[PDB]
Write a protein that binds this ligand. Structure first.
Ligand SMILES: *[C@@H](N[C@H](CCCN)C(=O)O)c1c(COP(=O)(O)O)cnc(C)c1O
Ligand SMILES: *[C@@H](N[C@H](CCCN)C(=O)O)c1c(COP(=O)(O)O)cnc(C)c1O
Ligand SMILES: [Cl-]
Ligand SMILES: [Cl-]
Ligand code: NA
Ligand code: NA
Ligand code: NA
Lengths: 459, 461
């Protein structure tokens, strides 16, 4: 029962420190790429995130090796997943390209060293100023998400006398029109492509789709890819062209729970279900029914960085609350542990019911043998971590003390830009472990002077 | 059914421009305190929030008037609701005090002009550095939320040789142990107070509670206040002391849907359900069963600023999507309108299923007669506004065009500090309408340079 959950969770804890490519233990402390995380959290003020460049490289290798059966594959990291400049730099130095989701993301990618021919710009709202900036910078692709936005691409490319390179985003009906804001209908692809061919400064490269995020099955990718391949094949015949590419988007899942033998990915997508190899096998099998020479573009986000960070947060308070009966005798006790990170720091734990493994990094070799509830510091009754090991309860060593460092694993995707300054708690610093195992700060914690510098006031 | 929902929504629209103390129309445009909001959105880049100092002043009056039967009432604005400096300054100018929820909130309240004796510091995690800053600045109250924290208050007040003024937060059990992280158990209040009396530099002023947010009935306040009052009375007798105060927290709701004849506040807490007068009557009646002279502290947040801002966002794209059967016949059309604000700008619309009235501010006098779906700009399938007029559908004029300005009303509570830079879209500017009806920018939109300046990297060559 609960004893079996505790035994299972401690087997997973032992696997973290005795088999996991990312982690070790030393002096009783969790280590990441040889870096003692208790020690690291004494150097830098908690809470903060620490990223591993080695793990980013491993994730990228998994993705690229998955596509070995198709040589002409181009990989664009979805920078909305994490765009801290040192993280983008690690990804650039690992040899892949970048996908951007706003004018400022395009600019960041250019400023960290991605060339224009290494950038894809996606979005449902690309205003004229956004489009002008992208076209002026010779981006590899600007997707086309609506007919309205295409009229601006035609007009602006003519004004600049510069070619805009596009893919037409189609969303296959695998309710789409009522639940999917993005893309054109499949029915609209032929006429849209026809008109693009006639535009003097717009070049049509191919079609685009994106299935979703943390997808726990391969069938959605296979079916959606087939829709895109069949339409690509047909339009090549109808229009008398050969497409440069097909862009199949992202959505390769990451394991957030590892004990797959106990999990159902279609009911709980914290279990990853498929691997990068499964995603590639499905995509390539469909593309190769049409062409083996065509370029396949992919836009993985979560898979590049998700497993490659840990959130380190200090236990900063504790209390016991007790439910009493009618005679004043104890019914049960609840042990609350408060950490210095809440949902303003780790937003998806609250807003998207996201699970992350939690361990006492200061006592990582000790049995996690006590049921606790884990709270954040925000003055808000809802700011505690509800996605526990058993219901809303977590497991930590009974020896846990204030001052210990708690780690949340798999904290590298969609965790930095989603932070807030609610309660005027600062957004976190971020540390990078580089390929040599050395650490450096890559984002400062917001200072007080940051809290008010955006405001205009006299004091 | 749907036709009557449409009729009702347009009745609500006419009430905004006819009988709402905040709004008017001019040239077919929504106006706020006489400021044309279509025009304002041509001066400042969208999306942005606009606050009304007159409406904050009105809300503060409603709260203060509600407590007229208890002269010794102190009102502390819960600054976690909105701490833009110009907003805090307006609240200080209106004559009330401030509640703070972190060290930086305390610091900004002091830097905008609140005296230490006008500030309450609350929290479940007050680290030694936070407590030292608070004690050094002679705050009116620091709540005591745990026995662990109390040990630090004793040690730090001793180090500074400065009295720390405290209230003991109790969570009335009205499952509390499993679901309420804040406060002590009632059963722990007596010994905690006993310890405090013996500490040389800690001064016990009373007990504290906070019921919750957007509470749509008076009974929870009455029941919880009675628990706190009963224990206050008992501890005066046991300990032989006279408390200075009781702090009953916040929770006054704001109307987010106005047609109370069509709503049940107990099933849909977007309907307010009670007024500030009902809150005061409930609290005061319970306190006066104990003492009529003791000071009552209240900590309203949402009610101070909620109705006092509008989010202005430009329609930036449009498309029609069509579902076909397997033989190419139309099943339905969906008209999508895309605005330049998404959940990174208006977080509670997504994360807390919060409803805000949506109108076309550029066509405020035109019938809102077309069902549409309203999407944001984030490259994320879930970034569209789900809390519609009917299910996930909203109503806008059929002739809505790209370039029109959409207003979300009642956007003044918990909407600024909760923004993010997801997708590297900037957090928004904020405009203030002062008492004379004039406008000024009080918060800039994040620039590209602001956004990259937190990062440490070598500029590529
Ligand atoms: C990002 N897609 C979003 C991710 C939302 C996270 N909260 C979605 O809703 O699907 C995206 C990606 C990367 O997706 P990944 O799941 O991180 O691999 C790739 N291409 C596009 C166009 C895209 O919007
Ligand atoms: C605020 N309490 C939070 C508000 C979070 C909403 N997202 C809660 O969950 O209850 C608070 C207040 C002001 O509450 P109001 O509802 O805005 O009036 C007052 N005192 C305390 C201690 C407090 O946490
Ligand atoms: Cl590549
Ligand atoms: Cl003494
Ligand atoms: Na710390
Ligand atoms: Na062309
Ligand atoms: Na004392």
């Amino acid at each position: 029962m609960t004893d079996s959950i505790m035994q299972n969770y401690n087997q997973l804890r032992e696997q973290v420190i005795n088999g996991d490519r990312r982690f070790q233990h030393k002096d009783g402390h969790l280590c990441f790429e040889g870096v003692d995380l208790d020690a690291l959290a004494r150097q830098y003020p908690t809470p903060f995130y620490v990223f591993s460049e080695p793990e980013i490289i491993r994730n990228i290798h998994e993705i690229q090796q998955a596509f070995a059966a198709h040589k002409n594959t181009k990989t664009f990291f979805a920078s909305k997943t994490c765009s801290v400049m040192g993280v983008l730099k690690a990804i650039r130095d690992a040899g892949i390209c970048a996908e951007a989701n706003s004018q400022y993301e395009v600019r960041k990618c250019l400023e960290i060293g991605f060339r224009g021919d290494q950038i894809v710009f996606n979005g449902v709202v690309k205003k004229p100023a956004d489009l002008e900036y992208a076209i002026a910078n010779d981006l590899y692709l600007i997707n086309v998400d609506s007919l309205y936005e295409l009229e601006h691409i035609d007009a602006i490319s003519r004004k600049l006398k510069k070619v805009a390179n596009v893919c037409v985003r189609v969303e296959p009906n695998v309710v789409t029109a009522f639940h999917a804001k993005s893309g054109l209908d499949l029915e609209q692809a032929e006429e849209t492509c026809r008109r693009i061919l006639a535009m003097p400064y717009v070049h049509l490269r191919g079609l685009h789709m994106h299935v979703g995020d943390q997808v726990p099955e391969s069938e959605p990718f296979a079916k959606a890819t087939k829709v895109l391949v069949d339409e690509s094949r047909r339009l090549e015949e109808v229009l008398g062209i050969k497409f440069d590419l097909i862009n199949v988007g992202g959505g390769i899942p990451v394991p957030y729970k590892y004990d797959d033998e106990n999990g159902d990915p279609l009911k709980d997508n914290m279990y990853a279900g498929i691997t990068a190899q499964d995603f590639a096998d499905a995509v390539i099998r469909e593309v190769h029914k049409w062409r083996t020479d065509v370029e396949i573009c992919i836009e993985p986000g979560r898979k590049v960085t998700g497993s490659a960070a840990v959130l380190l947060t200090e236990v900063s308070c504790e209390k016991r609350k007790t439910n009493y009966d009618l005679n004043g005798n104890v019914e049960c006790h609840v042990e609350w542990k408060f950490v210095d990170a809440g949902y303003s720091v780790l937003s998806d734990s609250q807003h998207f019911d996201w699970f992350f493994y939690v361990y006492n990094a200061s006592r990582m070799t000790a049995a996690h043998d006590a049921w606790i509830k884990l709270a954040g510091p925000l003055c808000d009754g809802g700011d505690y971590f509800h996605m526990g090991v058993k219901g809303e309860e977590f497991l930590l060593p009974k020896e846990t003390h204030v001052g210990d460092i708690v780690a949340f694993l798999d904290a590298g995707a969609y965790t930095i830009e989603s932070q807030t300054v609610f309660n005027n708690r600062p957004r976190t610093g971020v540390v990078m472990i580089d390929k040599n195992g050395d650490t450096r700060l890559i984002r400062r914690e917001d200072s007080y002077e940051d809290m008010v510098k955006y405001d205009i006031y006299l004091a």
